[PDB]
Design a protein around this ligand. Structure first.
Ligand SMILES: Nc1nc2c(ncn2[C@@H]2O[C@H](CO)[C@@H](O)[C@H]2O)c(=O)[nH]1
Ligand SMILES: [K+]
Ligand SMILES: [K+]
Length: 897
């Protein structure tokens, strides 16, 4: 079989590679790679190698990688360009795997692990590793087993062994409810001292060395801590055994507050799952803790345990070990439905890069373009340094703060990559420049046509229309590949149905599943044989068809991500193909496109509605516009509609049959104005929002850029039974917003948009009345404790001290401990309180210690709390929407109705 690599590393003059050989067995080899680079040569020198500009090149084959590195330096000193792939790992992978890689993930050892550490304060510093590791949960994908290393004796407490029988029992039976499916997959190993624990873990590691090392927050805590702990206890040499090549690299990261440590283990690809999640998930959750993402993805309640998390081992060691196991399973569950690990492998093998490079758009695209050009004997340009110069970003319209009853949004398809293809922007397609007028002149089409022969962008750049272009050609390839895999996905879908229709009274005769390609529709002859297969064979065929569907899904999602990350690479000064002029040409064209279409839509709606100078477009952000449909609805007459679904259908039709054609018309004109290579500005209806028919709801409101709320009924063709609240930038989900207030503010917004001012006013009165009976933890706000010592002057706040830091200081005077950088709950205190200040703070996720809890709660300033956390932000919403959360005085007040 075709072999595939696992990991690759460069150590001196050799490439250390772990891979799956022809016999499907994992192996390691050291290769004295002889790299090739290129230098320009005279036309006289005949060759097949040319750079992207068409200039001839000659190949230089080196004896070793060190010589190639020196040569580059020598060329640079002189001033000559040194072309070719300077990252020898990519060159090696490109030469060694000169074919489309077909990998088998079941042979790739993926470890998902977790390291637990008890400490008096509860947030031990990884770079120090001053405390013992008292629990290690290591799930191995090949063995499909959870290895649990449990420390029984510790200076922080001696405990008894974990009970695998108690773990399964339900909550009421005093159990932990460890899923029945994984109970038999647990290998529990108790230890009396940390040294034996760690040494056995280290041996275990040498036998089942991870290829892919993952888990939640593994890069910032687990890895650094175990590496440093082993280093402190057994010495650096022992710690280096965590790397199959005994080579390690410790990088220190600087930040506003402190320094972090990141350990690179040669021979291992670390993919912290929290980062993998943040990169591939198409959302932006207000929190990325395992509990939050678990509830969101798996819809399961966060683990429950009384008391602080740093006290869980001492207070309930049984639940401590059971939960560590469950948390790892949780990550595994999240990967089961999101498939991010596999997505990483798919993307990695596609680009032919180290798997961990998926976190780097420039690295990924560099390899893709490199391998693609190599097939045409084209040589890549040497990377050149560029200063970080800020250039125009996306266009975001300043909205008029107000309520907007009916809104309809439209958006462009893959904007930036489409612009690249439309204008044909690439380093080698630059054809010149033209005298540029102000941007508003192109938007209004008052400026003279830039060029009659070249494709233009509003920033003053011109490109050839006749030439393909490396960047645009590569985008197109990926786009065509996405459709191809989409086709396989659908084919494996129709084939799956043919197999299911057969599972209805299948023949009993014994047979085997057919050897067919599920990516293509079944031929006639295949469908006839399928009519005679037994259930056993059909079920096996269904399993394979689905396996094919998923692979198709992963492949097309991979391509989508590649396309969406390209612009980021092109705007990165470290990208080989970066060009400030091209980055600017893309963004300014984007800005022109949105404002040009905003003018077109306004002109069209004023005409159609017989109005004048009316502003229909109320907001726009990057690739979408929001249109007020109030006038459109009035034109028809609201009493003319039967129900909500009626006006929604009307706007859907109006958008599709009227506005869209006008928009397409507007964009084709812009394309001719800029004389672009091809029209790709495709904008169509996205959402339709408004209040339910016959209600007094306001539908939606904007407070400013990126701050608004909409009551959505339809999203690109899919009609919702229950409207969905689209809320953005109103901080109703922000971690600093108290729990009860997050729910209250949302309810306030739902009522405003769906029921009206009156309903809002009754809920406001209701929440305010109930506020003082809610649990104190649910109404406290949350802040991060940064720079505590800075304002710590003899125990009291120095000048310019933050409100929450002041709280932390009064807490310290009063007395869990507050750890630098960590989060804390904050509560204001009434004047005359015994704590000596206007507020107090304590560790988040915990109750206030008993010695002061009741005093604190008795001095809590509920009024100030309510005003600051609830009323202030609500007032922001209502002022923008022109409403009162409190009924204004009326002449009818003095009456008793
Ligand atoms: N065509 C091409 N080959 C390259 C480049 N950089 C390195 N090579 C090497 O050229 C050789 C094969 O044609 C291999 O050893 C490649 O790794 C580049 O930009 N283009
Ligand atoms: K964790
Ligand atoms: K836990």
């Amino acid at each position: 079989m075709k072999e595939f690599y696992l990991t690759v590393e460069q150590i001196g003059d050799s490439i250390f590679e772990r891979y799956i050989d022809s016999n499907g067995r994992e192996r390691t080899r050291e290769v004295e790679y002889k790299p090739s680079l290129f230098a320009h040569c005279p036309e006289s020198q005949a060759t097949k190698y040319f750079d992207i500009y068409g200039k001839p090149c000659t190949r230089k084959l080196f004896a070793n990688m060190r010589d190639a590195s020196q040569w580059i330096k020598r060329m640079e000193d002189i001033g000559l360009e040194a072309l070719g792939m300077d990252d020898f790992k990519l060159a090696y992978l490109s030469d060694t795997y000169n074919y489309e890689i077909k990998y088998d993930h079941t042979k790739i050892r993926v470890a998902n692990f977790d390291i637990e550490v008890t400490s008096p304060d509860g947030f031990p510093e990884p770079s120090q590793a001053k405390h013992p590791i008292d629990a290690i949960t290591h799930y191995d994908s090949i063995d499909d087993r959870f290895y649990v290393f449990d420390l029984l004796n510790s200076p922080y407490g001696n405990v008894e062994e974990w009970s695998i029988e108690i773990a399964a029992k339900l909550q009421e039976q005093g159990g932990d409810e460890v899923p029945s499916e994984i109970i038999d997959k647990i290998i529990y190993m108790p230890f009396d001292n940390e040294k034996e624990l760690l040494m056995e873990y280290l041996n275990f590691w040498q036998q089942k060395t991870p290829v892919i090392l993952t888990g939640w927050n593994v890069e910032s805590f687990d890895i650094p801590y175990v590496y440093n702990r082993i280093k402190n206890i057994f010495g650096e040499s022992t710690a280096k055994r965590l790397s199959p090549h005994r080579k390690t690299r410790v990088k220190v990261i600087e930040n506003m507050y402190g320094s972090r440590e990141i350990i690179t283990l040669f021979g291992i690809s670390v993919l912290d799952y929290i980062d993998l999640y943040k990169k591939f998930s198409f959302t932006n959750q207000p929190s990325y803790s395992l509990d939050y993402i678990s509830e969101f993805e798996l819809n399961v309640g966060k683990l429950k345990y009384d008391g602080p998390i740093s006290k869980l081992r001492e207070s309930n060691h049984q639940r401590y070990i059971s939960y560590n196991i469950i948390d790892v399973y949780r990550v595994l569950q999240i990967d089961a439905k999101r498939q991010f690990i596999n997505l990483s492998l798919d993307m990695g093998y596609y680009a032919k890069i180290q798997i961990q490079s998926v976190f780097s758009p420039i690295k990924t695209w560099d390899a893709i373009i490199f391998n693609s050009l190599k097939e045409q004997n084209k040589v890549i340009p040497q990377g050149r340094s560029h200063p970080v110069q800020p250039y125009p970003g996306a266009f975001v319209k300043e909205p008029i703060p107000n309520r907007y009853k009916y809104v309809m949004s439209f958006d462009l398809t893959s904007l930036y990559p489409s612009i690249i293809r439309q204008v044909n922007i690439s380093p080698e397609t630059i054809a010149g420049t033209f005298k540029v007028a102000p941007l508003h002149d192109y938007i209004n089409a008052v400026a003279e046509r830039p060029s009659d022969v070249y494709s233009c962008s509003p920033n003053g750049m011109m490109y050839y229309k006749d030439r393909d272009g490396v960047v645009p050609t590569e985008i197109t390839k990926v786009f065509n590949q996405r459709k191809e895999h989409k086709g396989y996905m659908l084919a494996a879908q129709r084939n799956g149905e043919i197999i299911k229709e057969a599972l209805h009274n299948p023949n009993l005769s014994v047979d085997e599943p057919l050897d067919v390609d599920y990516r293509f529709d079944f031929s006639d002859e295949i469908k006839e044989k399928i009519k005679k297969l037994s259930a056993k064979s059909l079920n096996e065929m269904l399993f394979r068809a689905q396996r094919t569907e998923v692979a198709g899904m992963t492949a097309q999602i991979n391509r989508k991500l590649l396309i969406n990350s390209l612009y980021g690479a092109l705007g990165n000064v470290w990208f080989r193909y970066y060009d400030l002029r091209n980055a600017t040409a893309i963004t300014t064209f984007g800005q022109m496109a949105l404002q040009w279409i905003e003018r077109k839509v306004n002109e069209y709606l004023n005409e159609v509605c017989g109005t004048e100078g009316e502003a229909f477009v109320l907001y726009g952000d990057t690739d979408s516009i929001y249109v007020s449909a109030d006038k459109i609805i009035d034109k028809v007459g609201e009493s003319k509609f039967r129900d909500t679904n009626h006006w929604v259908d009307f706007l859907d039709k109006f958008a599709r049959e009227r506005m869209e054609p006008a928009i397409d018309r507007g964009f084709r004109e812009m394309c001719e104005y800029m004389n672009n290579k091809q029209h790709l500005m495709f904008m169509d209806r996205e959402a339709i929002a408004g209040p339910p028919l016959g209600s007094k709801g306001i539908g939606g409101f904007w407070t400013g850029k990126k701050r608004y709320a909409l009551n959505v009924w339809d999203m690109e063709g899919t009609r919702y039974a229950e409207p969905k609240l689209k809320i953005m930038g109103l901080e109703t989900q922000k971690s600093s917003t108290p729990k009860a207030v997050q729910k209250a503010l949302k309810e306030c917004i739902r009522r405003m948009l769906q029921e009206g001012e009156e309903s809002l006013q009754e809920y406001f009165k209701e929440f305010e009345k109930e506020f003082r009976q809610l649990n104190y933890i649910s109404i406290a706000s949350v802040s991060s404790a940064n720079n505590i010592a800075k304002y710590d002057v003899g125990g009291f706040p120095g000048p310019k001290c933050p409100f929450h830091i002041r709280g932390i200081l009064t807490y310290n005077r009063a007395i869990p401990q507050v750890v630098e950088g960590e989060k804390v709950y904050v509560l204001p205190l009434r004047e005359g309180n015994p704590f000596g200040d206007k507020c107090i703070a304590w560790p988040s996720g915990t109750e206030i210690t008993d010695l002061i809890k009741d005093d604190v709660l008795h001095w809590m300033d509920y009024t100030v709390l309510l005003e600051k956390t609830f009323i202030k932000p609500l007032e922001g919403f209502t002022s923008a929407a022109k409403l009162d959360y409190e009924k204004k005085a009326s002449l009818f007040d003095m009456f008793d109705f």
